[PDB]
Write a protein that binds this ligand. Sequence first.
Ligand SMILES: CCCCCCCCCCCCCCCCCCCC(=O)O
Lengths: 379, 379
Amino acid sequence: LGLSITGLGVQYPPYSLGPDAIDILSKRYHPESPAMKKVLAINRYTGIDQRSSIGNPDHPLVNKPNPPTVKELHEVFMSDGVPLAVEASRKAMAEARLVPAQITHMVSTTCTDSANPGYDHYVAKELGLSDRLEKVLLHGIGCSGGLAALRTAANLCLGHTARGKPARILVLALEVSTTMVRSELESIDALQETRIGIALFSDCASAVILSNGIGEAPGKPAIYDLLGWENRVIPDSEHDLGFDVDPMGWKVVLSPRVPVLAKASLQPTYADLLSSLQDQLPSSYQKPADFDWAMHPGGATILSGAESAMGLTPEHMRASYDRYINHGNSSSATIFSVLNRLREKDMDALAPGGKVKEYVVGCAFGPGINVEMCMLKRR
Amino acid sequence: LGLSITGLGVQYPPYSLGPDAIDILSKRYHPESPAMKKVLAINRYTGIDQRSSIGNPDHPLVNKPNPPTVKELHEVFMSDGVPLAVEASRKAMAEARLVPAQITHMVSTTCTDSANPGYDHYVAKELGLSDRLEKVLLHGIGCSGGLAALRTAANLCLGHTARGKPARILVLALEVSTTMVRSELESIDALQETRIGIALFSDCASAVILSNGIGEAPGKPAIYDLLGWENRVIPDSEHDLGFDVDPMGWKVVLSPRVPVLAKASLQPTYADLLSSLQDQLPSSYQKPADFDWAMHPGGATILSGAESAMGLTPEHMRASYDRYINHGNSSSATIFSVLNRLREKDMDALAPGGKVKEYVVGCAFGPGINVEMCMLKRR
Ligand SMILES: CCCCCCCCCCCCCCCCCCCC(=O)O
């Protein structure tokens, strides 16, 4: 295929918040109620130690009499979110040793903004990218966005390959979820339903460069080679997982069924992934535990579910646990943060069998329910 | 390249709104004011006779004490817009002689909805498309979306060509703008600014099937072959055109510069398009007047601007005027409606000098400002 990730960059925002950040804001704006009690309790059962945020509980946006409107949310997405995407993209470009003029496409995603021009326009502008740049801003897909953007970039790379053209694609995910805290609080208080969104999600931008190899001076270094991918939708599961537009932003839909449906989808999707490319793999990469696993940490039960279904230890998904515990679920931006972390020396120390694996399965689930899986070779 | 459009389908909603529709609603919900007076005057000089709509001025969505919220807008996008998209897609597939299992990708666009799962998920499910379908839902681009989606589908088709696989891509645009009438009325009244969007925009869904030829019969019919494409961003023009998310939907941004910038972009974009394919065109197809022009009718001065810049008659853009006069500006869905109409016998009889052209230039502009242009060969 000639497809390789030649750079990765991750930018988390300045603030790191413990579980009491939610308690502070809840107390400030709502009297205690049964549903709030339940959710405040759940906020402490996730296994997330700290979450990344563009701000703290005293930020003016979330301290109005009302939750901020979707317009007010957009304003902060641009002032505090966009800067993170530019820095993540610069880092990925620096690692890949590419200059702005060499970027041929950009595939971006977010589920926590709506805008025309889209946020990718402003990022490309700050990076000084070409006025001829081909851009894709994906919408509709939430947490599976990082891998869906990577898969989309792969297809686009191969389109240029078919024409004998160099392709260097900036693949970007930016999520700013923590600003919707007051919206979720209002829904919990007024509707008295146990909405677990406030407990899970955080802010982040992450980027990789995907190259089709054409035009590279030979023997050029890469971090991962992209070998293959699979994608599926789980039937009759639209009502289980979603993010509905609202004058207050977007409202989380997240049912108890989600981690059950996700776990059941793992084994047959992995089978299809592996069968499409097994003849490219060595004898030491045959069963799920032989690989390192870059799982999107959608929640604690996704990780324990995956360990259970595939027969893995936590250390097989060490970088996933690392991001989840220390940063929380940053939706589409999390997966590239995981792949970035996985190749660092202190994750190497924790490799199952004392063997850092040459092959990595990536996996993510999102609204649909959409399942995304990919196979990487780590150089 | 082996790329062709093998089917097209267009579905307008049943209702047609004359210039009185805006008068009815404004009088019902707002006092007389200078800004309202100006907009009501301008409305009658747009060059539009009728605008296609999912409803009439007595629709309950637009007759509440306040404008509908973006949540209420989504509900109607889903109930009234999605069925148009399913039917436009069905018709494109029918002309292409394809069954649901043959569709390998879907590339969709809208700027008048935000949802997760996006509207494309629900359209694909209604059509019975594959659980393995690769989907792209574009955001951030508004009116240029039809051609951006076509261009994106072109790169994706070629991705499959690189692997020797068949690609048949459903390319879909759906816009429902008429529902934001109370939002724009409120802005005109409140801000006392002459906002002309209310007078221009309408509702439509349109779709094409783009094929990469692999596994097609030798010399398989098509309606158009896709020969090439160009895309550019006009620098320093983000403020000139846009669609900002808001509790009441999205608010139109439009400066006086737009017609001049659009007009001025034609010559260099066209020159680049043609330079990239000079020895694929006959010498009888060199200057703009040599081609038929499928121009996105953004407004009357866009069509007249193009005539002036490029030395064309109104009949060079006959299908563009036909859509504009009779249906209004349906944003991203308009271009495929124009391309569908252009090939009808009725438009043939109005060709410049009675010469129906073998090559068609498609052109659209949207927020960015993004310019898109493509070269089609008509069969
Ligand atoms: C800026 C001030 C910081 C305030 C305290 C920080 C705590 C914030 C709680 C997080 C709110 C979560 C809102 C849910 C976002 C959902 C993301 C997409 C999920 C999906 O794809 O369905």
